[PDB]
Amino acid sequence: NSNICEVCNKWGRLFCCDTCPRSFHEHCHIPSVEANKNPWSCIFCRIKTIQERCPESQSGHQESEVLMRQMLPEEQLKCEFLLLKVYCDSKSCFFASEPYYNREGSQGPQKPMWLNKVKTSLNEQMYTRVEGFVQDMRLIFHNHKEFYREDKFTRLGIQVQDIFEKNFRNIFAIQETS
């Protein structure tokens, strides 16, 4: 197995995947690495199995159909993995914890949002449809763009949103378009 966490790229107390060479800190993995379970398979492995059991699940889909899906176990897992893929980018640090807003010439957002809040919401099964999760994720970046206005720091929101959107299109097999 790898000797660094797949998500944060640091060493430490790592839990190893039994079906692939990835390793994880306990709370870097989503869901948090399960207490017992031998063997243990990570989220990358679990997502690969879904695809392997239903190869047609990779044919193209319309975003509007994906969003209205109820959060059954497989969709819950896919949103967990999408969230994890965002945390895998080091620029996610900017969006992880609860923000505050005190900048001359700007007003904070009406509905603040952050990664750890989305993480908690998934853990607590607060989303009934994929749309709930996607809306909160996109609101993280939209709030950031609006608040930072013409400061060049706005680009961090563009960057991490692009990681989110690419992975959303991959994980949920959205139909490719120009």
Q: Applying CB under 5 A, which residues contact Zn ion?
A: 5, 7-8, 17, 20, 22, 25, 28, 42, 44-45, 54
CB of 44 to Zn ion, least distance (A): 5
- Compare residues 19 and 154 and give the one whose CB is closer to Zn ion: 19
Residue type, 118: V
Token pair of 37, please? 């379970």
Are 29 and 80 within 8 A, CB to CB?
A: no
Of 33 and 134, CB closest to Zn ion: 33
CB of 58 to Zn ion, least distance (A): 11
Q: In whole angstroms, how close is the CB of 111 to Zn ion at the nearest point?
A: 29
Say how far apart CA 85 and CA 29 lie, in whole Å: 10
**Which residue's CB is nearer to Zn ion, number 29 or number 144?**
29
How far apart are alpha carbons 119 and 96 in whole angstroms?
Answer: 9
Name which of 21 and 175 has its Cβ closer to Zn ion. 21
Asked if residues 95 and 109 have their Cβ atoms less than 8 Å apart, the reply is no
CB 107 within 8 Å of CB 25: no
Residues in CB range of 129: below 8 A, 6 or more apart: 67, 68, 69, 70, 71
Q: Which is nearer to Zn ion, 54 or 68 (CB)?
A: 54
Residue 139 beta carbon to Zn ion: minimum distance, rounded to whole angstroms: 25
Q: Which two tokens stand for residue 172?
A: 């949920």
CB of 14 vs Zn ion, minimal distance in Å: 8
- Between CA 112 and CA 114, with CA 113 as vertex, the angle to 5 degrees is 135
